[PDB]
Amino acid sequence: TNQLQYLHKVVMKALWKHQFAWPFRQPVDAVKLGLPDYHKIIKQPMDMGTIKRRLENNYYWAASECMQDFNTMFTNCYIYNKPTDDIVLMAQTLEKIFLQKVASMPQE
Numbered sequence: 162t163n164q165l166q167y168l169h170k171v172v173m174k175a176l177w178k179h180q181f182a183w184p185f186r187q188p189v190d191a192v193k194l195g196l197p198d199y200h201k202i203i204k205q206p207m208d209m210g211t212i213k214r215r216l217e218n219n220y221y222w223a224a225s226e227c228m229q230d231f232n233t234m235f236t237n238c239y240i241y242n243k244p245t246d247d248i249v250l251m252a253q254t255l256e257k258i259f260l261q262k263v264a265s266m267p268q269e
């Protein structure tokens with residue numbers, strides 16, 4: 162759809178290249194990060210690499226599902242980390258761009 166095309170070529174294009182994008186371009190590696198509780202707390206991991214792959218393979222049936230994947234990625238970050246962590250602020254900056262671009266998505 163026009164909306165999924167927009168999410169791929171506008172929203173993800175802007176978010177993927179952002180200076181703050183790098184921790185979100187692939188799954189949280191709880192083993193490399195020394196986080197034995199990450200998967201005990203975060204039951205649905207999500208990342209931009211997964212979302213990008215889903216958009217490339219036409220995995221989504223509705224723009225709202227892709228939006229939920231973005232939202233889950235950000236919420237995972239806010240829920241697992243501590244309020245003062247830099248990563249929370251990076252998520253907030255990316256999420257603001259996400260919402261700003263979503264405000265201009267084509268209707269269906």
Ligand SMILES: CCOc1cc(C(=O)N2CCC(N3CCN(C)CC3)CC2)ccc1Nc1ncc2c(n1)N(C1CCCC1)c1ccccc1C(=O)N2C
Pocket residue numbers: 183184185187188189190194196238241242247248
């Ligand atoms: C794919 C790996 O990516 C990461 C990379 C680095 C990294 O600096 N080096 C630095 C030098 C690199 N060289 C340089 C020389 N060359 C020849 C070879 C390559 C090697 C790797 C750190 C963390 C990463 N990965 C991450 N992925 C999700 C999260 C995440 N870190 N952080 C953030 C903390 C501050 C910024 C990222 C979290 C940390 C704890 C708990 C949760 C989260 C979290 O919520 N997220 C989403």
